[PDB]
Write a protein that binds this ligand. Sequence first.
Ligand SMILES: Nc1ncnc2c1ncn2[C@@H]1O[C@H](COP(=O)(O)OP(=O)(O)NP(=O)(O)O)[C@@H](O)[C@H]1O
Ligand SMILES: Nc1ncnc2c1ncn2[C@@H]1O[C@H](COP(=O)(O)OP(=O)(O)NP(=O)(O)O)[C@@H](O)[C@H]1O
Lengths: 87, 254, 254, 253, 253
Amino acid sequence: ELVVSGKIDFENAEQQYQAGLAIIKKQTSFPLIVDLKQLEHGNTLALAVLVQWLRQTPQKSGLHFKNVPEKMLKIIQACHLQEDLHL
Amino acid sequence: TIAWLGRLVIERIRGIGVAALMLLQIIFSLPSAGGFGRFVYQMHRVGVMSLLIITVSGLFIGLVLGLQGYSILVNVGSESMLGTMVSLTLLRELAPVVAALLFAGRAGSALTAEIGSMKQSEQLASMEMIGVDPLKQIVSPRLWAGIVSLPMLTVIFAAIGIVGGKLVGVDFLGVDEGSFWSGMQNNVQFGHDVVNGIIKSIVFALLCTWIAVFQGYACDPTPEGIATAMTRTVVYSSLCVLGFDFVLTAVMFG
Amino acid sequence: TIAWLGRLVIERIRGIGVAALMLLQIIFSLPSAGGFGRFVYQMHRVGVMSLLIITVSGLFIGLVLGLQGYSILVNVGSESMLGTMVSLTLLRELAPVVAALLFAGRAGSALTAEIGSMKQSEQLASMEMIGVDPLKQIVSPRLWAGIVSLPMLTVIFAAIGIVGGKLVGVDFLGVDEGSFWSGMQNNVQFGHDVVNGIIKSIVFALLCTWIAVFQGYACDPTPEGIATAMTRTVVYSSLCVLGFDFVLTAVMFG
Amino acid sequence: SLIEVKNLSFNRGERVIYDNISLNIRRGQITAIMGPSGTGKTTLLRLIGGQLVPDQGEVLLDGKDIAQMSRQELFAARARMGMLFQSGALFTDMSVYENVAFPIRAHTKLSENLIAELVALKLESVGLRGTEQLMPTELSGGMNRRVALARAIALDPDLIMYDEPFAGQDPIVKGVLTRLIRSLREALDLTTIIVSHDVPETLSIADYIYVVAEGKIQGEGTPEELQAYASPFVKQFLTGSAEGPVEYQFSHQ
Amino acid sequence: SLIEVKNLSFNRGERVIYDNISLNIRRGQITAIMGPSGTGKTTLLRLIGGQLVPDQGEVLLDGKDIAQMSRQELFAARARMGMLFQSGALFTDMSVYENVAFPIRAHTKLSENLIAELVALKLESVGLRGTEQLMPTELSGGMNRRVALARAIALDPDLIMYDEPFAGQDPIVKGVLTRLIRSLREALDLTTIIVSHDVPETLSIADYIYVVAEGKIQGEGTPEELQAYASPFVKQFLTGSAEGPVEYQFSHQ
Ligand SMILES: Nc1ncnc2c1ncn2[C@@H]1O[C@H](COP(=O)(O)OP(=O)(O)NP(=O)(O)O)[C@@H](O)[C@H]1O
Ligand SMILES: Nc1ncnc2c1ncn2[C@@H]1O[C@H](COP(=O)(O)OP(=O)(O)NP(=O)(O)O)[C@@H](O)[C@H]1O
């Protein structure tokens, strides 16, 4: 599987975002479950990046995330209690 | 889209009707019910406190007219005109306008703010709850102190202006003094032109103070309202003075 | 008792020192060109929103000058003098002063009130912690809108005043278009009857707006202070315009 | 972040507001400051935040003296904190989108597309997903204040300061703000400071409390300790009791 | 005396603030009104028989309709009321002595000697003896409220209205105002009305409470009874719970 990984910060946000889009452009086969365990914690823009990816393909195509850091979930659960919390 | 303007025009005119009604209610000479010590006091803020500003302005206007008159008159070769023109300019057009605009102007703005503050603060509401009709305590002496004060300040303004005019026109610039005083008498008179200057100032005093009271008092208690009202009084006071100045001068000297 | 005045004077003058320091910082360093693309927006509230007042006053002043000029000039040379006096008066003394004071009123109090609220609500202060220097983000485009706007308004005031003068002096009262227009050309020089009107306008635009910004950006965060600031910006820029007008006209035409 | 405040002294003109205040803002904890009206509570936060010049005081961020920081260090440091001011401090000239988005432009250079997504996420976290593109001046009281908070947490700061959050009068709002503080405190691992009035609401939130009056610390402790060591000033203050060290003019003949 | 308001309806700004309000103000008792902010609390008190004109309904004092019946009676009747409006008003141009003295001149014709003595007695009743010559603008906030109250009770009125006296303050002051109300309701045989957002204080003071929201009475009772009838609105309102008939704006997508 092709995933974006590592530290996402404001300094490289644009590039990590485009890398994910390149993967989506080539994503002719799915579901693909994106493993986020290799993601540095505490940065909400990472979520903004993940959501914009969802907004291009996964929201209709059936793509998901796995091994999501507990912290990312705590941020989501501030209010999005309707999230698709399933693997 | 377009109707926005239409609603704005309609509401502003409705407000005028209210202002007219308020003026009628306040003007009846009812305040005699209480003491007038309050009037004398109120005059302190609308009149006495503004003498410095009007005096300094009058001196600069006088000196400016002196220099501009002179640099034109030296091309006529007829210097007797400094007397005639400094006097007519100040008595007919500038004292009644410059004084009115500096007056409300400063007094105009301050008065608006003060009454409006009393509305915002609930002080006025309390008075009605007690039983003392606020128009006879808060508004009455303010409207009248403004009426007496502006006309009196108009005279001082012109007086300073004439003196400032002579100070440069005759005393620094070499004009024979006798022609200055003679030029004033030839042909502007105390019994006509001075009188018209005063009449215009009575009219302006009423327009300016009437608006300032209305803008402060007659408004639902919106927190941003005081600053807006202060700006609005200056703008309406100013246009009303100039619009009326035109129609009155057009008759008095037409 | 007496020392009270002493303290008042000492503090007001300290404040002018502060104002000078503020002006230096705002004009001296403005590298953030990317954010200055918005001053065109800011201009909306200084320039665009003020044409109605300047235009109406310009027309009334032109018509008044026409009528007073005429009733004096029928005894001296209206055929030649309405042209010369209407245009020199508006270019040299009235567009630079009447527009300057109407502006000080309508734009000046509104602007100071706006900065005042930005400070009072603490909204402005919250920007310091975001790293956005409020002078470059809030004050800069306001001071610049003032500099450009007043001079353009000054020209319009005179343009309307010429229409006003002609409308009564030539078209209702019986004077030749020929000599009105040629008279103006014979006596009005671009260099420097038009040019000096503009120079005085720039000086007033800077001085007047500078004061409005300074007072709005007040030290004391008390609601009573907004109304005080509004009254003071009108009074101080008003005297400063008259004071500087005197000196500049004294040089320009002396 | 641990913030040290030592030997703080500050005058406003000639008046002394603070006189050798010593604080320990504990990492990951909620600390709070209570005291009488008008005793400089807001002044103290402004000094902690570095927006005022302390007189001979020492302020350390993670042990670093703020007075010695370079322009770049200071600028970067600004992205570590956010504050909610007493009036809400919203910008009336901008819609909600910009009010929350605004601080992002002070520290980042992002594409409009990512900026928009962060705004959407932050508004959702406080129940404001549906206010997008409305001017803030059209919001009801509770909504108005929630927007301002959304700005404060927009950059994922380490420290959030709340200046008088419980001074709201509406019992419904008190309910919501209490929950948001607890919710956000956990979701973002925040260190927070609550500076307020009306004791029934800070004594159940803070982990540690300082009682400050007349430029001095009048006692410190957990809610339990303050009662245990409630020097009469503190005791009557926290109780809201009459007959404390409170005076009025009195003499008769 | 007893005050009754029936079938009250009032429209301001094209919106209805009140819709068929029916109140019974019990003599010698403390009546209180609670509800969300911005829903007419000041307005309803003004409509008690002040300066506002209802569109429908009646106001009865001693069972008599105050509308029309007559000019002289109403002028005199007005001497039976005293009020603190919001923050409390003091006239800035008058000394404390004059602010308390002021309403006396609306109904009496007394010698300077007696008007002076009444002011002295009324200021002592609220702990202000000896502050007569200071201008009110130089007082601390705790004293501004007490001066205004002295004015309110200056004429020995029967009805004292406190418009939101507990809304926002210092816990010391809350202790003092509570005591003044307890002292005065007894000392002067008063009927009082407390209208306030700070539910925990109102609940231990009033003898009877109305809960008013959205222009209607949504429950009534002694504080013990209100707790027994948990209409979702009243129950959330009186408890501070964030759950109940309140809204947030969101929908995921
Ligand atoms: N430059 C200045 N000159 C004079 N006064 C100022 C200035 N800047 C701010 N203020 C002061 O700012 C102080 C802020 O603290 P304070 O008065 O205790 O308000 P506060 O903390 O919001 N009160 P509270 O809500 O009870 O906690 C006031 O006492 C003002 O005098
Ligand atoms: N005279 C007026 N005319 C038109 N609108 C007004 C007037 N006065 C105030 N407003 C509005 O009418 C109402 C004033 O009374 P009110 O609702 O009783 O205030 P309140 O509940 O005591 N306010 P608050 O203390 O903040 O909760 C509000 O809805 C205002 O927006």
